[PDB]
From Swiss-Prot:
UniProt-listed InterPro entries: Thioredoxin, Thioredoxin-like_sf, Thioredoxin_CS, Thioredoxin_domain
UniProt-listed GO biological process terms: cell redox homeostasis
Cross-referenced CDD domains: TRX_family
Source species: Bacillus subtilis (strain 168)
MF GO annotations: protein-disulfide reductase activity
Gene3D superfamilies linked: Glutaredoxin
Disulfide bond annotation, renumbered to this chain: 29-32
Identification of the protein by name: Thioredoxin
Family indicated by similarity: Belongs to the thioredoxin family.
Known function: Participates in various redox reactions through the reversible oxidation of its active center dithiol to a disulfide and catalyzes dithiol-disulfide exchange reactions.
Keyword vocabulary terms for this entry: Disulfide bond, Electron transport, Redox-active center, Transport
Length: 104
């Protein structure tokens, strides 16, 4: 549908409504921009079955620290308010949609 944005202020509310993938990112990191169209493919293919939330590590430094994240791109998967998976680096579409469909 459309990808969401959050910070420490609201990431906890956003992750507490369904299956929610998150992308801990920063714009100076090449791989964060390389995985962006792959996340848009997931938003087209599954972005109603799950939510996708962009979250920037400079802005949510505390919240990323809540999961020991201080490196990017770092994907998280949360479900009804709790983390259930974490992954780091770029991924191709097929692997990412396989990873997602396993936790729908």
């Amino acid at each position: 549908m459309a990808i969401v944005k959050a910070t420490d202020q609201s990431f906890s509310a956003e992750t507490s409504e369904g299956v929610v993938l998150a992308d801990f990112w920063a714009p100076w990191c090449g791989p964060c921009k390389m995985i962006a169209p792959v996340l848009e493919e997931l938003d087209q293919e599954m972005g109603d079955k799950l939510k996708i939330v962009k979250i920037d590590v400079d802005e949510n430094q505390e919240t990323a620290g809540k999961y020991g994240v201080m490196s990017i791109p770092t994907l998280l998967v949360l479900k009804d308010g709790e983390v259930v998976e974490t992954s780091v680096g770029f991924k191709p579409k097929e692997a990412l949609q396989e990873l997602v469909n396993k936790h729908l």
